[PDB]
Design a protein around this ligand. Sequence first.
Ligand SMILES: [Zn+2]
Ligand SMILES: [Zn+2]
Ligand SMILES: [Zn+2]
Ligand SMILES: [Zn+2]
Lengths: 184, 186
Amino acid sequence: RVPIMYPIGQMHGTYILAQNENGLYIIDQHAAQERIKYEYFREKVGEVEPEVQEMIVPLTFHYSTNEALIIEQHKQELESVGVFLESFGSNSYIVRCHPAWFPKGEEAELIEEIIQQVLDSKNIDIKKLREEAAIMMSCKRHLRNDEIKALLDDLRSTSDPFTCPHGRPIIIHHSTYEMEKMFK
Amino acid sequence: MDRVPIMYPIGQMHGTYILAQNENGLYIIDQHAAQERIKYEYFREKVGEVEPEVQEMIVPLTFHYSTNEALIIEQHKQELESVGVFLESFGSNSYIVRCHPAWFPKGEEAELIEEIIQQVLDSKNIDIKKLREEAAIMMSCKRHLRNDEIKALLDDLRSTSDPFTCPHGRPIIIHHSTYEMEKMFK
Ligand SMILES: [Zn+2]
Ligand SMILES: [Zn+2]
Ligand SMILES: [Zn+2]
Ligand SMILES: [Zn+2]
């Protein structure tokens, strides 16, 4: 957590500069937006029955006898993250629909990316898959002052305003104390 | 040394720090330390000048001393001369100050003149070079800035001999290069 951050400005269209009583905050815009998107998708994937949307271009996949074994093992886990596989023929599946909240235009690559995660873990439970899926979903010109403000406000009210879902810094903070030291 | 490239303002915080940037990255600036450096070189130039525009005072200043101080003060009457302190002796060990350089920090013209004098009285035996410096420093130390003010400050800091360090040895500028920032955010 962190108190209200007041915008100073932005630079190179990459970083936001802000301040409050605790000192100075340098904020990576992109990282901040991953974190904010994550808090959203992590909730969405936790829903038992999400609004569903029928695709326009349905997808097909095909797997080795072994990959299909793993996929049948993880039916419930895959469906719980929004991947609705229907097997037609041998080791082949169609995807006919998905949650309405999947990131538009990247459903195809998301579904295949999630399915690939399961094939790699070989044995994975729902909680871990939900985390992984939401991380994947989260990473699917200069900002206006109103845009900087919404961003600082949204970031502040997430679970971890300091670190992106991939574990990288969102915020470099120079405290009042640290700046006093820096300069004396 | 390498001359810092032009800096562009982002903003300020707490009436204490200036935020700036250019292609090279981010600059965090102690605005007071910056103002010191600027003013220091300005006054260090003036006090090194040969003939300054002098300004008479409405009410001259009076200074009384002992047989020691009046002794020292009368020895350095060319060193306090160039430093801007003009002591006219009328009685025994007694001086009046009619005038002083027009570029003397207003309001505290007297406060300063005494400090320059004090410095002399303290070091006891002190040469031109040291006094000259000490005087410049005293004049430079003698609210939230807008981006226009911030800009003017950045340009002036650039033109100095040492934009990174104040006359007291403390850092003026903390620089994060674009590469170093990318490293910090991995
Ligand atoms: Zn990303
Ligand atoms: Zn990330
Ligand atoms: Zn000062
Ligand atoms: Zn200083």
